[PDB]
C-alpha cells in the first residue's frame, strides 16, 4: 500500500490532483496521508520562507546608477496553492518574482537620490515592502522579509565622495 501513501514534509503542503475531479480546493498539511493509488496524485509546495536575491543596477531620481540588492523572504499562501498550481505552476517563483521584484525595486529607488537612498535605507525598504506585498498578493504570495542588503554607486561618484571626505581631513590638517 506504499503507493497509496504520500508524505508532506515539515513546512510543505500538497495539492491533490484528482483524475475525476481535477485539482482539489483543499490543501493537506504535513504528515503521511492516504490517496487513491492511481486516481489521485500529490503536488508538493514549499510553505516556507524562501529567500530570493535580486541584484540590480538602476537609476535614482537624478538618474545616476545605483547598484542595489534586494533580498526577500517569500512563501505561497496555502489556501491559494491550488489556484496557483492551476494559474502559474510549480515554478511560480521564477515566473512571477523576476518581474514584480525587479520593477518594484527600480520604481521605488527612482524616488530617492543617493543621499536619501543611503541615509533613509529603512524608508526605502519600507516602501519597497509595501509595493511588493501589494503586487505579490495578487499572485497568492506573502512576503516575510524585504531587505536592502547591498547599496553602492558608480566608480566616479564614489571617487568624488572620497575626495570630499579627504578635503575635510585636509581642512583638519590645516
Amino acid at each position: 500500500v506504499n503507493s497509496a501513501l504520500y508524505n508532506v514534509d515539515a513546512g510543505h503542503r500538497a495539492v491533490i490532483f484528482d483524475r475525476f475531479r481535477g485539482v482539489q480546493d483543499i490543501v493537506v498539511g504535513e504528515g503521511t496521508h492516504f490517496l487513491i493509488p492511481w486516481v489521485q496524485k500529490p503536488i508538493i509546495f514549499d510553505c516556507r520562507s524562501r529567500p530570493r536575491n535580486v541584484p540590480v543596477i538602476t537609476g535614482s531620481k537624478d538618474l545616476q546608477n545605483v547598484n542595489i540588492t534586494l533580498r526577500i523572504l517569500f512563501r505561497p499562501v496555502a489556501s491559494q496553492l491550488p489556484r496557483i498550481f492551476t494559474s502559474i505552476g510549480e515554478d511560480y517563483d521564477e515566473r512571477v518574482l523576476p518581474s514584480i521584484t525587479t520593477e518594484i525595486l527600480k520604481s521605488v529607488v527612482a524616488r530617492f537620490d543617493a543621499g536619501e537612498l543611503i541615509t533613509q535605507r529603512e524608508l526605502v525598504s519600507r516602501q519597497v515592502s509595501d509595493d511588493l506585498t501589494e503586487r505579490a498578493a495578487t499572485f497568492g504570495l506573502i512576503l516575510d522579509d524585504v531587505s536592502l542588503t547591498h547599496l553602492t554607486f558608480g566608480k566616479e561618484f564614489t571617487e568624488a565622495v572620497e575626495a570630499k571626505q579627504v578635503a575635510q581631513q585636509e581642512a583638519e590638517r590645516a
Binding site: G22, T58, D62, T86, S87, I88, P98
Partner: protein
C-alpha cells in the same frame, strides 16, 4: 487494453483540452478542464493548451519623446483566454504567443515609451508600466490573450548620457567638497597673518 488506452488522455493541472473532430473540425463549445476525459480513437483528436501565466521578455532599444535611445526590457505574463480556446486554435494554432506578442508588445511598448523623456521614464516607471499594460490588454484582447502582469525590468540609456549623469552627480559631490575648502581657507588666513 491497448484500445482503451488509445481512447483516454490526461490534461494536467493548468492545462485545458479542445477537440478537433473529423466531422466538423474543431468543436466550438468543448473546453475540457483537469481530469481524464475520453476521446473517440479516430474521430476526435485532443489539442492541449497550457493556460497558465507564461513569462515573455521583450528587450529592445526605442526612442524617448526626444528621440533619445532607451534600452528597455519589458517582462509580460500572458496566458490564453481559457473561455475562447477553440477559436484560438482555429485562428492562431499552438504558437499564438509567438504569432501575436512579438508585434503588439513591441509596438505598444515603443509607442508608450515615446510619450516620456528619460527622467520621466525612470521616475514614473510604474505609471509607464501601467500605461503599457492598459494598451497591451486592449490589443491582446482581440487575440483572446490575457495579460497577468507587465513589468519594465530594464531601462537604461546610452554610454554618453550615463556618463553625463554621473558627471552631474560628481559635480554635486564637488560642490559639497567645496564647503571644506572654506574651513581650510580659515586656517590659511590665520597662517598668512
Amino acid at each position: 487494453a491497448y484500445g482503451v488506452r488509445e481512447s483516454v488522455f490526461t490534461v494536467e493541472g493548468g492545462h485545458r483540452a479542445i477537440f478537433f473532430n473529423r466531422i466538423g473540425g474543431v468543436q466550438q463549445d468543448t473546453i475540457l478542464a483537469e481530469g481524464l476525459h475520453f476521446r473517440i480513437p479516430w474521430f476526435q483528436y485532443p489539442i492541449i493548451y497550457d493556460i497558465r501565466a507564461r513569462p515573455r521578455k521583450i528587450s529592445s532599444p526605442t526612442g524617448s519623446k526626444d528621440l533619445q535611445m532607451v534600452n528597455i526590457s519589458l517582462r509580460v505574463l500572458s496566458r490564453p483566454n481559457a473561455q475562447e480556446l477553440p477559436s484560438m486554435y482555429q485562428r492562431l494554432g499552438l504558437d499564438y504567443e509567438e504569432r501575436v506578442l512579438p508585434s503588439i508588445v513591441n509596438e505598444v511598448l515603443k509607442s508608450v515609451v515615446a510619450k516620456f523623456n528619460a527622467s520621466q521614464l525612470i521616475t514614473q516607471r510604474a505609471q509607464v508600466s501601467l500605461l503599457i499594460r492598459r494598451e497591451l490588454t486592449e490589443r491582446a484582447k482581440d487575440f483572446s490573450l490575457i495579460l497577468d502582469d507587465v513589468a519594465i525590468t530594464e531601462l537604461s540609456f546610452s554610454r554618453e548620457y550615463t556618463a553625463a549623469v554621473e558627471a552631474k552627480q560628481v559635480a554635486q559631490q564637488e560642490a559639497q567638497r567645496a564647503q571644506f575648502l572654506v574651513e581650510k581657507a580659515k586656517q590659511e588666513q590665520r597662517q598668512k597673518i
